[PDB]
Every structure is written in structure tokens, then in C-alpha cells.
Ligand SMILES: Nc1nc2c(ncn2[C@@H]2O[C@H](COP(=O)(O)OP(=O)(O)CP(=O)(O)O)[C@@H](O)[C@H]2O)c(=O)[nH]1
Ligand SMILES: Nc1nc2c(ncn2[C@@H]2O[C@H](COP(=O)(O)OP(=O)(O)CP(=O)(O)O)[C@@H](O)[C@H]2O)c(=O)[nH]1
Ligand SMILES: Nc1nc2c(ncn2[C@@H]2O[C@H](COP(=O)(O)OP(=O)(O)CP(=O)(O)O)[C@@H](O)[C@H]2O)c(=O)[nH]1
């Protein structure tokens with residue numbers, strides 16, 4: 091069985107824990123209850139491969155920067171989240187991505203760009219501009235609704251396929 | 262994630278467009294304007310790989326300014342299309358074929374032969390005839406109906422499989 | 433074609449026979465009952481590979497200290513089963529696994545932990561515990577019910593895969 | 604796409620041509636027209652691989668036995684067929700198998716045991732001694748019916764799988 095180290099990264103409030111929790115436990119989290127760091131484990135088959143998803147749920151709040159360094163060392167792939175109703179979240183993602191590359195050096199680093207809360211009728215952020223970005227980045231993009239569970243399994247499973255490719259035809 | 266430049270080549274009225282928009286907009290068009298150059302991107306997974314399909318819907322028809330020249334050079338794979346109910350559409354294939362080979366300088370070129378309009382009870386091109394040409398070329402031939410969307414995914418994923426395969430070239 | 437030698441072990445009455453019969457005879461046969469130890473066979477295709485599964489159904493009854501070493505010795509992978517409503521059979525898993533680690537003389541030996549009787553209401557062993565143990569062993573955890581057939585194939589086929597994967601560290 | 608060279612062998616009267624023509628044309632052939640040697644080509648997708656199947660249909664007629672050395676020299680894999688209501692032909696696969704080995708000078712040659720005519724109630728060779736012979740040989744065993752089409756695609760696809768596995772044995 092293969093173990094994959096997924097880190098859920100992103101601006102505070104964007105829906106990280108809720109993403110993570112819909113996966114792990116299949117129920118939506120209303121409570122906005124911050125995070126320092128929380129671990130989750132999940133066994134799934136993806137493309138007929140028995141996978142152990144070891145997901146690290148991180149703190150998005152202005153602080154906890156510094157760990158924002160060693161979980162980046164450790165992570166094998168990042169869910170970069172932001173929220174379709176928040177543009178600054180959209181915007182700081184370039185930050186998160188630059189920090190990552192710097193903590194690993196590597197220019198090629200499994201990441202997936204996730205547009206959360208898409209159940210919200212009120213986007214200040216356009217799929218297209220998200221796409222344009224994932225594009226210049228070289229990475230997939232998926233719009234999700236932790237609330238409605240939609241695209242949740244794809245976000246995570248896609249990130250596994252990214253890592254997996256990255257370890258094998260990543261040369 | 263792998264991005265792939267695929268070009269939809271052929272003759273006017275074949276169905277290049279219908280084909281295309283069916284793959285992307287997932288719906289059928291007996292209405293699209295007679296083309297020159299129009300682009301499409303599709304994010305998808307094939308063979309557990311996340312793929313970004315960069316599709317150029319080219320044109321044949323009447324006049325067409327300046328296209329052909331260089332789209333080859335950049336095209337990675339070519340979908341060479343013809344209609345089942347048009348014998349002349351079919352002879353033309355050998356000619357698109359031929360320019361690619363010259364622009365590409367090789368016979369490396371990934372292509373998939375497609376016989377569109379699998380739905381007409383008005384065939385004037387025999388499968389057996391198409392199969393041979395394919396066989397001559399040593400490339401796949403898939404019959405399609407943009408109308409009923411029969412075989413359309415196959416055509417596209419087949420060509421991407423070919424590119425994929427081709428990339429192992431002297432490694 | 434590959435031959436795969438599977439050995440099912442667990443405490444008496446966990447459902448080892450049933451489980452095997454289900455995969456093989458395709459029905460829940462009840463009182464197959466203890467002490468008769470047979471090997472079954474089944475050709476099947478897993479992930480495009482054709483496999484000959486040679487399954488040994490050990491008689492967990494007047495168990496261990498039969499010629500158990502024989503089989504643990506010629507086994508390539510072990511299906512380690514316990515019943516969901518029997519804590520001791522779960523407790524016993526630790527003993528089977530040490531025996532297997534001794535006889536195979538290796539810490540990494542393909543095996544899958546199985547919680548049989550998914551079906552019974554009267555659960556004594558929560559899934560969390562079994563999953564934490566497997567996690568601790570680096571092995572998959574599947575819940576089955578030989579009775580409703582749920583989970584049965586996944587259980588064995590997750591095993592051939594463990595086997596297949598493990599094979600990869602030879603050379 | 605990949606090209607695979609399949610040869611169907613077996614005593615006369617067994618179902619070789621009716622197996623090959625069902626695959627290729629999807630029609631049962633009621634008449635018995637003895638074969639010398641026919642070639643067929645069928646393009647298929649196996650396990651996401653675009654395979655061009657070059658199928659050789661050979662003579663069961665002992666008379667044309669001189670042409671075997673040749674087809675055995677070039678074939679990559681052998682569909683070994685016998686009829687479920689004719690022991691002599693079950694007895695004959697043996698001699699076919701030994702010739703292939705000699706010609707090929709190898710113990711591992713892709714083959715598949717095919718017991719055709721699954722549809723006849725006058726079966727005379729039980730699936731168990733076929734299954735047993737197969738395991739001896741170390742190859743798959745498929746029961747087929749050219750008249751009903753049952754098992755025929757299993758039969759050819761399984762041979763493509765053997766070939767591929769077998770080739771893989773070096774990359
Ligand atoms: N409508 C909607 N609300 C969502 C969705 N995802 C999360 N939320 C809401 O957004 C708020 C933040 O969710 P949470 O998962 O805690 O975000 P977080 O990024 O983990 C925040 P932190 O950095 O502090 O850990 C919660 O009130 C939650 O219910 C979604 O897909 N749809
Ligand atoms: N029945 C049927 N009609 C089709 C199919 N594909 C295309 N057509 C018909 O072909 C006509 C032209 O299709 P279109 O895709 O625009 O042609 P083209 O090859 O794009 C044209 P151009 O080369 O000039 O850009 C339309 O009326 C459409 O209904 C198909 O699979 N089945
Ligand atoms: N409800 C339920 N009962 C089951 C299930 N599997 C087995 N059983 C029950 O367990 C009893 C014992 O099953 P068996 O398969 O013989 O277990 P065993 O491990 O072979 C026992 P032994 O090692 O002694 O031969 C069966 O008689 C049946 O009542 C299951 O998935 N669900």
C-alpha cells in the first residue's frame with residue numbers, strides 16, 4: 091500500500107478543514123473553528139492502487155508561519171485552497187506557492203489549485219481566472235463545495251495522481 | 262499533469278467542429294460557423310493521468326486565409342477527419358497527412374484517422390476502405406458520430422494515448 | 433499468467449472458510465466448519481494481469497502448533513482475519529502476525545487485516561481501532577461480510593496487489 | 604498502438620474459424636469450410652492499450668501440418684483450442700503445445716487454453732481436467748462458445764494480456 095503526504099494549504103477561513111472533514115468523515119462543518127494543525131488518515135483505492143492518504147490540515151490564519159516551512163518540507167503535495175467568494179485568498183496563493191518552491195527548491199512540485207465554496211452564489215473569482223492561473227502554474231484545478239461534497243473526492247484524488255506522476259514520469 | 266496540443270484537421274463539412282464542441286461542451290452542433298481558428302481546453306484524466314487537452318479546431322471550407330503553414334510544428338497530435346458520406350473528404354486525408362510529415366520533418370507524427378458521421382444510412386466510404394488507409398499509415402482509425410456522440414471520446418483519448426506512446430522516442 | 437499463494441488465518445470461527453468459499457463457490461456456506469484445511473483455486477484478472485489464486489484455508493481450531501510453519505513458509509501473502517464481535521480474535525491478530533514475521537523472517541510481509549462480519553449488529557470492535565492497528569503494521573484494512581458478500585473480493589484482491597507491490601523490492 | 608501476432612491452433616473441427624470470425628465479424632458460421640490459412644486484422648482497446656490484432660487462423664487439417672513451423676516461428680502468442688465434446692482434440696493440444704515449444708525453444712510462450720463449444724450438452728471433457736492441464740502448463744483456461752459468443756472476447760483479450768506480460772519481462 092502506498093502512503094501519500096498531502097498538505098492542505100491556504101488563506102484563513104477558505105474551507106480547508108471542511109474540505110478535509112468531508113473526505114475523512116462525510117459531513118459538513120458549520121462551525122468556524124480554527125486550526126493549528128491536525129492530522130488525518132484515510133485508506134482509499136484510486137485507479138486500483140491501495141492508498142493511505144496521510145493528510146495534514148494546517149493553520150491559514152495570519153499566523154503559524156514558520157511551520158509554514160517544515161510542513162512544506164514534509165508535504166508531498168499541496169491542496170492550495172482559496173475561496174470563490176474571496177479574491178485576496180485568490181491572490182495570496184501565489185505566496186503559498188512561492189514559499190513552497192523555496193522550501194523544497196524544486197520547481198516541479200505537486201500541487202493542485204482548489205476553488206472552494208462554489209455552492210455560494212457570489213463569486214468575485216472567475217473559473218477562467220482560476221484556470222488561467224493553474225495554467226501558468228502547470229497544475230490542475232478543481233472547483234469544490236465542502237458544503238455539498240461536490241468535487242471533494244476529485245480534489246484529493248487528483249493530487250494523489252499528481253504526486254504519483256511526479257515520482258514516475260517526472261522523468 | 263500533462264498538457265497536450267492536439268489539432269483537429271480535415272475538410273470542410275467533415276465535422277471537426279461538431280466533434281470538438283461535443284468533447285468540450287458535451288453537446289451537438291449542426292450550426293457552428295465555418296471556421297479558420299478556434300481553441301479549446303479540456304482538463305481530464307486518462308489512464309489515471311491528469312491531462313490538459315489543448316485542442317485547435319482548424320478549418321477547410323472556402324478561401325481560408327493563411328492557416329495550415331504552422332500549426333503543424335506546434336501540433337503534437339493530429340486528429341485527421343473525414344465523412345463517411347463523402348468520398349472526396351476521404352481522399353483529401355492523404356494530403357493533410359502529407360503536409361504534416363513535411364512540417365514535422367518526420368514520420369513520427371501521432372495521428373488518429375476518424376470517419377465521422379457513423380449515424381448516416383448514406384455511407385459512401387467503406388470501413389474496410391478506411392481501415393486499409395489506416396493500416397497503410399500504421400495509425401488507428403475510429404468511426405465517430407458527433408451527432409449521437411458515439412465514439413467521440415475514444416477518438417480523442419486514442420490520440421492522446423498515441424502522443425503519450427510516441428514520447429518514448431529514443432526515450 | 434501469475435500464480436499467487438494466499439493463506440487465510442485467524443481465530444476459530446472468524447469466517448475464514450466462509451470468506452474463501454464466497455470468493456470461490458460464490459455463496460455463503462455456513463457450517464463448513466472447523467478442522468478441515470483445504471486449498472482452493474481461482475483464475476481471475478486483476479488490473480489487466482491474469483492470476484491463478486491458490487488459497488489455503490487454515491483450520492483455526494485445535495490450531496497452532498500443527499505444521500503451521502510449512503504454510504506460513506510457502507505463503508506469499510496472508511489474509512489476517514478477526515470477527516467484528518469478538519475482541520479476542522482481534523487480540524489474537526498480534527500473535528498470527530508475529531508467527532508470520534518469524535517464519536517469513538521479515539518485517540515486511542504482504543498481508544491484509546480483515547474485519548469480518550461487517551454485517552453483525554453487536555460490534556465489539558470499532559473500525560477506528562482496527563484501522564489504527566493496520567496503520568501501525570503498514571497494511572491495508574478491509575471490512576468484509578462473507579454473508580452479504582460485501583467486501584469479499586476487495587479483501588483478496590487487495591492482497592494480490594500487496595503481493596504484487598512487494599515483489600518490486602527484489603533484485 | 605501496439606501490434607500483437609496471435610495464431611489460433613487446434614485440431615480440425617474445433618471452432619477455430621468460428622471463434623476468429625465471431626471476434627472479427629460477430630456472426631456464427633454454421634458451415635464447416637476447412638481452412639488452410641487465413642489472416643485477420645482487428646483493432647481493439649485492451650486495458651487502455653490500442654492494439655492492432657494480427658490474427659492467424661490455421662489448419663486443423665492434418666495434411667497441412669507442414670506449414671506449422673513457420674507460423675509458430677512468427678506468432679507471438681497461441682490460442683490453443685479444443686472442443687468440449689471431443690477428447691481426441693483435448694489430447695491433441697498436447698502435441699500442439701510441444702511443437703510450439705520446440706520451435707520457439709522456450710518454456711514460457713504465451714498461450715491460452717480454449718475449450719470451445721461450451722454450448723454442447725454432449726460435453727466429454729470436464730472443465731476440471733482442462734483447468735488442471737492449464738495450471739500444469741501454467742496458462743489461462745477459457746471456456747468458449749463461437750455460436751453464443753460467450754467467452755470469445757475473454758479468450759482473445761486474455762491472450763493479448765499474456766503476451767504483454769510476457770514481453771514486459773524486460774522493461
Ligand atoms: N457554503 C460553504 N461554506 C463553506 C464551505 N467550506 C467551508 N465553509 C464554511 O467556511 C467556514 C470556514 O471553514 P473551515 O473549514 O474552518 O476553514 P479553514 O480554512 O479550515 C479556516 P482556518 O485557517 O482557520 O483553519 C466555516 O464556517 C464553514 O462552514 C463550502 O464549500 N461551502
Ligand atoms: N449526422 C451528423 N451530422 C454531422 C456530424 N458531424 C457534423 N455533422 C454536420 O456537419 C455539418 C458541418 O459540421 P461542422 O463541424 O461545422 O463542419 P466542419 O468540418 O467544422 C466545417 P469547417 O471545416 O469549414 O470549419 C453540420 O450541419 C453538422 O450537423 C455527425 O457526426 N453526424
Ligand atoms: N453474520 C455473519 N456470520 C458469519 C459471517 N462469516 C461467517 N459467519 C458465521 O461464522 C461461523 C463460522 O464460520 P467459518 O467460516 O467456518 O469460520 P472459520 O474461521 O472457518 C472457522 P474455523 O477456523 O474453525 O474452520 C459460520 O457458521 C457462520 O454462522 C459473516 O460475515 N456474517
Ligand SMILES: Nc1nc2c(ncn2[C@@H]2O[C@H](COP(=O)(O)OP(=O)(O)CP(=O)(O)O)[C@@H](O)[C@H]2O)c(=O)[nH]1
Nearest residue numbers: 615616617618619620621632633637638663720749
Ligand atoms: N455448437 C457449436 N458448433 C460450433 C462452434 N464452433 C464451431 N462450430 C461448428 O463446427 C464446425 C467447424 O467449425 P470451424 O470454425 O470451421 O472449425 P475449424 O476447427 O476452424 C476446422 P479446420 O481445421 O478445418 O479449419 C462448423 O460447423 C461450425 O459451425 C461452437 O462453439 N458451438
Ligand SMILES: [Mg+2]
Nearest residue numbers: 106107124125
Ligand atoms: Mg481549518
Ligand SMILES: [Mg+2]
Nearest residue numbers: 277278296320
Ligand atoms: Mg469547423
Ligand SMILES: [Mg+2]
Nearest residue numbers: 448449465466
Ligand atoms: Mg474454517
Ligand SMILES: [Mg+2]
Nearest residue numbers: 619620637638
Ligand atoms: Mg478453420
